Design an enzyme around this catalytic site. Structure first.
Site, short mmCIF file in Angstrom:
data_model
loop_
_atom_site.label_atom_id
_atom_site.label_comp_id
_atom_site.label_asym_id
_atom_site.label_seq_id
_atom_site.Cartn_x
_atom_site.Cartn_y
_atom_site.Cartn_z
CE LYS A 97 -3.67 2.87 2.94
NZ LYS A 97 -4.05 2.64 4.24
CE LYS A 172 21.94 -11.99 -21.95
NZ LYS A 172 20.53 -11.75 -23.02
CG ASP A 174 17.61 -10.85 -27.68
OD1 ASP A 174 17.67 -10.34 -26.89
OD2 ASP A 174 17.75 -10.14 -29.33
N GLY A 336 26.64 -0.57 -23.53
CA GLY A 336 27.32 0.25 -24.22
C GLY A 336 28.84 -0.21 -23.79
MG LIG Z 1 18.64 -9.01 -26.04
MG LIG Z 2 -4.53 -2.61 4.12
#
Ligand SMILES: [Mg+2]
Ligand SMILES: [Mg+2]
EC number: 5.3.2.5
Lengths: 412, 412
Positions: A97, A172, A174, A336
């Site tokens: 909350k 790995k 994508d 980068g």
């Molecule tokens: Mg990727």
């Molecule tokens: Mg509550």
């Protein structure tokens, strides 16, 4: 025993009052209207404001919001007897909350050691990964397939071998590569393994394949178990699209027991804001390590969308701090990245990091093989205490890369 | 067929460039370098920029960032053949790596009717819930248990009766109420049921209990099934702490088949920013309905942390739009609710909404019974086409509420 949450608040009203309201409202609800018998009974469940650090106002922020906003770092303690020992309960208690209460951002969570022990941490960690890949000292090198969507297994194995022949330690899928008739999960694993075992012959180099584990939540365990049976090297997992608890479940299943690489996909919906969300050191660092990630890819502090340097370092520290009762997770700054940055990457993150060449490895004049050789040469150069250009004058692959992307200064 | 994502971008570089980059990069990756034979084969998988609406540069935004940023709404089409038919794949494809790309916010997602069909939608929806509780025409009324953490079953039963005796249609656990030895999940269900049965016998009024479904992900279906067997009325679920796919799993399990009430806890970590995250109409509205929520509680446009009116209405519209192939989900604006606001709530949201008295119902001078009586009296007044004070003159509970919190004017 309490979990202490640290928040950054911006408000035009008294922050202490709001903080006390949170500590009480999100725990026992009320206190002064309780009989003495109930107060003693609910005392152990009462939240408390632990500290409040006044930060002074920011004119930049004030101008943006069009009003004067006080700022403060608030720490609140939530008794652990208030919730079950699971991540969903932790998040709902400390930022459920509360995430809806205007300008509140979750910066950190601190847990008693006994509470932490109810969680697994990485199964293999940095040490385990190095053993499985057979690279003990230098930082590791990984890359990503390029344009595989819509391609077949012949292309997959071909592209996989090119990257492995480039000397990368891990390749790995994508993160957007989903199972299809052309590229079934189980076949990517088996054919990828056979293909990598071939490169193992041609070159003693052993390369691992992190296969994307996708699909519906309740089908993940079965697939992961199958992957283990088929000998998969690593499971790439888009944890933020599921839930932290799912990562923990995969980590704790003894029938899986395969390294897990956590991808940052979708984490950006939560981390970038100055006033809302959850800080990356916590969201990508502390919690993923605790949940069971052996590798954590996160926004690097380099390039077009570089993450603020201290933020990036904060993530890496959370992943490797040996003061935690969990194995260390491999920090993998991503995006980068280019060979000319290797010296800076190692200086910023140390030897226990992974250089993520990403899909860029394919952008090298001589393909992935050349790109991989350029990165490996760059890493070796740094460890040998040599300037890249010095090593480049003896390594063409690296020479090509440097001329195209340059070299980043590491001197302070 | 393709899913079209709508984004809000802020940037100093060419927006069209970035858009094309996203369309290509997040789909096939390469195109120009591909042989005519491969292009025809991969055509199906190619993403495309559908439209770009340039917006007026914002002085306020530029001052905040300290730079001049162009703003635009970008629409990108993602072929559904590129990803599996599940919410995790959808999120990763449309806002995975992209969520990390600087200032980008996901505003909406449009699916081809054919794709939507692979998802459940609410099992009961508004009509189903109205039948289950036996209330037609008038908006429903719900309240929340107060201070239950650390309390026992006898307390739960006594507090539940007070609320039901006040005339509320549904009572839910606090979202931070987790299972414990004092309040076991199954016991809350059975003890609550008995108590609610006693109240029916007493007043002929039917009241439902929304019990919190918590704990680890892979234990949810088993306990939800037990809840169904025990006769639970509704399952309260902190979906954002678990993942949208988990909500869908609970909805599609025929052995559960119990209404599901989605709680907004943690959604605020994603929705509030002007530059990042996911818009609430999509995150709380469209996606939760599609996933299977029969009720969706969301930030009301009233009170201390009121959600901008148009945003709140947008959520309700997504939940009830009759153009979708899913049943309508009950919109439940929550927070800042009191009897004096009923006329506005109905004027803003219509009759097919739920007045959430929340934990505030207990704050009435005469406890929850008086609080519920005040709300029911207010609802009847609006339906009888009369001013609240007219009814207040005949209903003490309502007058006490009005004198306590006042009446919010609805006259335009
Ligand atoms: Mg990727
Ligand atoms: Mg509550």
């Amino acid at each position: 025993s309490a979990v202490m949450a640290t928040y950054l608040l911006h408000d035009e009203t008294d922050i202490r009052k709001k903080a006390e309201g949170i500590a009480l409202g999100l725990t026992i609800g009320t206190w002064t209207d309780l009989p003495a018998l109930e107060q003693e009974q609910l005392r152990k469940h009462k939240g408390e404001v632990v500290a409040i650090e006044e930060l002074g106002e920011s004119e930049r922020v004030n101008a943006y919001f069009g009003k004067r906003l006080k700022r403060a770092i608030v720490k609140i303690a939530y008794p652990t007897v208030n919730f079950s020992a699971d991540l969903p309960a932790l998040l709902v208690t400390t930022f459920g909350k509360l995430s809806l209460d205007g300008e509140v951002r979750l910066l950190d969570l601190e847990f008693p050691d006994e509470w932490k022990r109810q969680f697994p941490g990485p199964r293999f960690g940095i040490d385990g990964i190095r053993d499985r890949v057979g690279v003990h000292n230098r930082p590791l090198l990984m890359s990503i397939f390029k344009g595989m969507i819509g391609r077949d297994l012949a292309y997959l194995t071909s592209e996989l071998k090119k990257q492995a022949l480039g000397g990368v330690d891990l390749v790995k899928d994508d993160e957007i590569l989903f199972d299809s008739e052309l590229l079934p999960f189980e076949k990517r694993i088996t054919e990828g393994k056979a293909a990598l075992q071939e490169v193992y012959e041609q070159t003693g180099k052993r390369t691992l394949y992190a296969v994307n584990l996708t699909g519906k939540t309740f089908a993940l365990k079965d697939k992961a178990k199958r992957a283990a049976e088929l000998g998969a090297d690593v499971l790439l997992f888009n944890v933020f699209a599921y839930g932290l608890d799912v990562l923990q479940a995969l980590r704790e299943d003894e029938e899986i027991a395969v390294p897990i690489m956590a991808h940052p996909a979708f984490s950006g919906a939560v981390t970038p804001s100055e006033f809302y969300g959850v800080a990356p050191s916590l969201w990508l660092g502390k919690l993923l390590r605790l949940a069971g990630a052996d590798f954590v890819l996160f926004p690097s502090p380099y390039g077009s969308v570089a993450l603020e340097r201290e933020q990036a370092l904060g993530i890496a520290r959370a992943l490797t701090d040996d003061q935690e009762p969990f194995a260390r997770a491999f920090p993998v700054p991503s995006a980068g990245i280019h060979p000319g940055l290797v010296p800076l990457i190692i200086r910023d993150f140390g030897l226990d990091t992974i250089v993520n060449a990403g899909g860029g490895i394919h952008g090298h004049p001589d393909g992935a093989i050349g790109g991989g050789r350029a990165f490996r040469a760059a890493i070796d150069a740094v460890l040998a205490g040599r300037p890249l250009r010095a090593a480049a004058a003896e390594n063409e692959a690296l020479q090509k890369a440097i001329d195209r992307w340059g070299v980043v200064e590491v001197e302070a």
